[PDB]
């Protein structure tokens, strides 16, 4: 059920041992010594990774190392499509802007932070959650020249439990992290977007990196003189596999959860956030799909934009399914009613006052939040010409010196980036007509961005005419229209341009709504500090975990499938046979790598197949994970690596608010499948040889 | 693999059935010389199965089987199709015109008699051995002089089995006064609607209730207010004990057709011609139709039924091609024929190998013609609505060329034009469908093989299909209402003779008939070779584990209540529940609306004695019985012969089961009798129907 702090391992250890954990507590996490925790990294700011060799080899997801694989891909060596396998360490590719973070030490600094906070005076101060304020406290505690006396090391203080607990992290950051191996995208991204959030899953979602450092193992930026890192700890690879009900545990960096939402916040999340995102994205995607299916050239230009819109659309559908069917609202209502009854018995009304302040803030910001999501989903991300060029103050105060030619070159560069090889003005006019028709039906005239008032006032309610006019008269409506403006540029032409006025008008409303809504966050945050303090004082810190905040957490559960619906059971494990069942050579998402298909036909599974002779691919577990847990190590009862977490089923996405024991699962790529691909597909034996593989 | 056995085969199967769980005595299930459970099974309205469930002639069948009767009695004031129907007294049961129920009174093996009569061979290539006219002359000769007059209600029929190696005579008793008694609302009767057709898990309460009426002596009689309910020889007892995984289950019914003795070349032909063309052409047709229906709500109303009708055999062809691709159907037919050929070589008889060779040679020779036939049938005949536009008859053209018969000819042509261009016809949607369908057709069928009018695409329109179609509608008398009325005011034979739509329709129907007539002669050598082929198969491996092909005659099948794994890591259990109906509820999707009375029964758990041991309300179950079209409405029996459900569908993964039974995928989809009784009770409130049934604890 939870995403536990490392400090909470002592308190959960007996429950974990009862659930099957065999390793000693301090071998998993030791606050004053080397432990398994030391082999876990924050990979490139938002993923998790793990050290799997004494030479700094790192495993993470294919989708986590995707940008690095793509940056090294060319028409001559397309690593994204064919995979990449460095046959020697010297052939491993450096990556600019990459990092791996080790959590060297973790310390509870609650009393220190709370004592420092007593000097505030203003009760409503938000310094208790300020990264700038907490960094000044972290620097004071670590010392004046800490990073100079301890190179590669840095300190950070974070708030937990709404500001009721503070931890200081000492981090070791390495920035020379090289690409070592990757399967082809047909394996690494087998499901592609069709299987995203889906279980059963048949994706070999892994990539391999290596941490490099100076001669002493200290962090150093890229240098040809850097040597592989010999770490304090690395994971042993298990080849024993998994069976149903086996104990499994994960360490990683879950980003965000909302476990302490009031019932009113669940209602708001459903009725505003999710319903607007679902309604607006379905309109956008519907027009886009019609156009992509009618023209193969439109499919090429819009495939990535369509897939990017679908990802959070599916998340919102899964989240709304949980609100509708798993009683999330009701369970938050029961959680807050229990605290209110306990507060009434203790003679302390502050918990009931805190829940009331959250409800009153939610109810007061309702119309504004609705207007914000409507413009963000409907226009800001819904219509491409909302992000068309807006001339700066510097650019107009140049057009009306020879700096007129420089202003036009800057505007031209932005026009060329908006109307790029993937932009269709015709598809965008169609999407805008459907999106604005919905937007104009939902947002009253007095609440519209100023330019949108022209639909009723100037165009007699004809949205199609309004959109046609924007393109017909705008300097960004076509290449010929821009070039005619660029030849004779007037600031009066730009100031009256229908597309400039639309873009300016919608961004002005988006910012005015953002600025008006920002003040409502603070009373809710302040009330949550009191609310969570009451919850913890009443039921304790065990069963109720602190919300995820991109910090190192552990979660434990079992390898177990689930029943998605009446008479249907999804087991705990998928096989290579499932990849072959899904093969469709004329659908790019489900093409099968010929070397992999041959391994399957010949049953060349070696030491990686299960006892039945079947090749496993992926498994699922009752661990509690979220975004940020991509690439996380999945451990055995003995702490040996059995897989990498890479996704979670859509039925469990409401698990960020309420864990769903009968539906929520972490989707994990089996480590045996990872090794079979490195071995029989990549032929990269040296990587197998440097890992410590246990029989 | 698993079969559809003749009643005659119950004796030789009985010990296997008993070891698989059957508890009832052989002659209680079927007895050729007495009353048995076979006497409670009926052929319902020519193509469904039904069963008698009371001593007062009450009959259960599917909702989709009694659908036309429920619809014929529905009005805006009493919409029985939508709200259900529950006659609260026998006098309130509604008569139905053109309905029938057929009882299989006697079944007799007449093989020796038919084979002796056949020896009077004028031609050794005669097809009389399979002729309904010839076999009826033999049935009439055996039954006697005016048998129908001496035994009113009874009739005799002889059918060929095993490709003409076995003949059975059936004595049938037909009743034509069959009244509507009860039906759930369509939201229960067709809950999955087209989305869940061929789908397991399934949550549909697919049942309807009728009653057989007869004269005072229980003899068949057409509808009369003086008719009384039939007291039958036998009826099914209803079980409330339910089902559990691995329980024995058996069915009796009338499966229509199978192709269990196809050669490997016939499987290849079925895949590469029949199925690939139907799939390719229907996907083009459906794709254009769906885009138009999604862009215009009025087009969705007009084309929903045509779209759904096209999809049904399209999904069947996809499921059948999945089996050919993944279950080795071709290979298993090849192994079946190679084994017979090896055994024939050892026996010194080359006739079996010669028979398989004749089938292969006939299949290979008719390939181009059969491809051209399926291409025109799927592509144009079925694919394009203006192919079925009016064609003036020889008598209509003669009437137009000096009498009052001119206005008679115009009124007949007008009636046909009005039926073609009806409230559901869109000329614009049809032009779009025709442009996509003809583009595919013209790419597949060479110029010299085209219907004559289609040659104008290359010759007159420079290959522009859109211009050719636009021209058909712009210049045709049937292109619009105003164009027809202008023709009707000044009709000339010459206008009709040069009409582009008339020429298109005539041209495509001429080619369709020429292909049909050229292909028909190839059926006979295959049929004659199959008589020898199946004779060899039976002489070699016996009439024990190879059943005769289905031919709309009474058969039994047995298996177990068991689910299956459709794909890697996915398991579909053997039983669905009322919770599955509630999970599927979508009030703004007509297919998945839930009846408010049913939703209340679920919320209150008002399941009575109908719920399972765990308090869950069962809906449907699936079994390893071997069924096909014609088995809708079939009784599903317990090990004791008690009714446990009604068969109503089969999963798409098992549709290849008409050629090769698929033990790990093929299932019969059955509505649980506990759910039927729950709906009659808590939804219909029709207690009298429960009271007349014999319900066993
Ligand atoms: C194949 C596509 C079109 N979908 C039906 S889906 O399975 O991806 N589905 C996953 C989650 O529920 C929906 C939001 C979409
Ligand atoms: C998109 C898919 C999942 N279908 C809804 S389907 O109706 O096309 N399909 C159902 C399974 O059996 C096939 C023969 C047809
Ligand atoms: Cl380290
Ligand atoms: Cl012979
Ligand atoms: Cl099978």
XYZ file of N, CA, C and O and ligand atoms in Angstrom, chain B residues 1 322 327 660-667, ligand 5:
45
model
N -12.419 -34.381 -34.273
C -12.619 -33.808 -32.933
C -14.117 -33.533 -32.648
O -14.896 -33.472 -33.608
N -8.467 -16.496 -38.415
C -7.576 -16.601 -37.262
C -7.298 -18.101 -36.985
O -6.163 -18.471 -36.677
N -4.418 -22.378 -35.850
C -4.764 -23.702 -35.313
C -4.460 -24.884 -36.236
O -4.808 -26.017 -35.906
N -12.919 -27.657 -38.125
C -12.120 -28.403 -37.165
C -12.466 -27.886 -35.774
O -12.217 -26.726 -35.463
N -12.998 -28.761 -34.921
C -13.321 -28.423 -33.539
C -12.050 -27.943 -32.806
O -10.981 -28.490 -33.027
N -12.150 -26.890 -32.009
C -10.985 -26.298 -31.350
C -11.118 -26.434 -29.854
O -11.626 -25.536 -29.219
N -10.661 -27.544 -29.282
C -10.838 -27.850 -27.867
C -10.387 -26.765 -26.893
O -11.053 -26.572 -25.884
N -9.299 -26.045 -27.186
C -8.801 -25.021 -26.273
C -9.369 -23.619 -26.496
O -9.003 -22.708 -25.752
N -10.261 -23.430 -27.486
C -10.785 -22.106 -27.785
C -12.281 -22.063 -28.007
O -12.939 -21.101 -27.622
N -12.825 -23.085 -28.641
C -14.231 -23.134 -29.006
C -15.189 -23.395 -27.865
O -15.129 -24.447 -27.220
N -16.131 -22.481 -27.666
C -17.135 -22.628 -26.622
C -18.556 -22.240 -27.091
O -18.732 -21.321 -27.895
Cl -7.532 -25.887 -30.030
